[PDB]
Amino acid sequence: GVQMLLTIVGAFAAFSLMTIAVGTDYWLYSRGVCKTKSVKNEEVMTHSGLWRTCCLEGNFKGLCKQIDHFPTAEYFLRAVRASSIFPILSVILLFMGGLCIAASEFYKTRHNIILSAGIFFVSAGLSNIIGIIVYISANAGSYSYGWSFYFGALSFIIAEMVGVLAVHMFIDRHKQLRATA
Amino acid sequence: VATPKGSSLRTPVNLAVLKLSEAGVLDKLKNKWWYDKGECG
Numbered sequence: 143g144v145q146m147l148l149t150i151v152g153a154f155a156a157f158s159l160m161t162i163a164v165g166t167d168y169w170l171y172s173r174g175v176c177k178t179k180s181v182k183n184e185e186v187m188t189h190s191g192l193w194r195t196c197c198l199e200g201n202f203k204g205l206c207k208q209i210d211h212f213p214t215a216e217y218f219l220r221a222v223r224a225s226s227i228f229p230i231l232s233v234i235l236l237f238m239g240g241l242c243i244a245a246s247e248f249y250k251t252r253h254n255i256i257l258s259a260g261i262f263f264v265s266a267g268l269s270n271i272i273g274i275i276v277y278i279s280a281n282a283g284s285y286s287y288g289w290s291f292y293f294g295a296l297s298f299i300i301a302e303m304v305g306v307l308a309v310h311m312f313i314d315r316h317k318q319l320r321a322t323a
Numbered sequence: 324v325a326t327p328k329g330s331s332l333r334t335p336v337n338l339a340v341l342k343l344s345e346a347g348v349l350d351k352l353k354n355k356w357w358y359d360k361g362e363c364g
Contacts, residue, residue: 183364
């Protein structure tokens with residue numbers, strides 16, 4: 143009862159946090175530009191996310207551009223980093239975990255719909271680590287990570303905690319069946 | 324800057340160049356063409 147309530151709340155939190163990270167732009171406070179060619183540049187602080195980059199300060203404060211991820215083993219990294227498959231697949235897996243948790247609230251007989259939720263959450267956390275590493279690794283080849291990056295990192299923790307909690311619930315269901323039979 | 328020998332412009336030109344160094348007009352043009360109108364940043 144109370145354990146399922148924590149799981150529901152934690153599931154939503156991690157999903158929400160991760161969806162707010164993949165959607166925002168405050169990932170990396172870098173030092174670049176925001177505009178393109180014209181008939182010199184303005185290197186000012188630019189809070190740059192995954193898809194867009196607005197110049198925090200400077201004459202063009204708030205102009206977001208489209209990060210150009212393509213300026214053997216390096217092409218593959220760029221493609222993964224450019225499509226943010228991992229940061230986007232964690233959000234797809236966390237959402238599927240919520241459906242599994244919700245499905246297990248209307249079909250109590252099926253105990254295998256709770257284990258699925260746990261695996262989804264746990265796998266979502268693992269997919270958010272490759273995203274972090276891919277991000278940092280690709281971004282490499284002075285900065286300061288922002289709140290958007292920390293929501294992605296914080297999502298993992300919340301998701302991993304929901305993952306263990308769901309596994310515990312699965313085991314608890316089966317323990318009840320092994321005591322009444 | 325160069326001038327034919329015996330010219331009357333040797334001294335006015337020589338002083339003009341010095342007058343443009345203290346004022347920083349020789350470094351402003353160098354920055355204008357080497358860096359301001361540059362491409363590598």
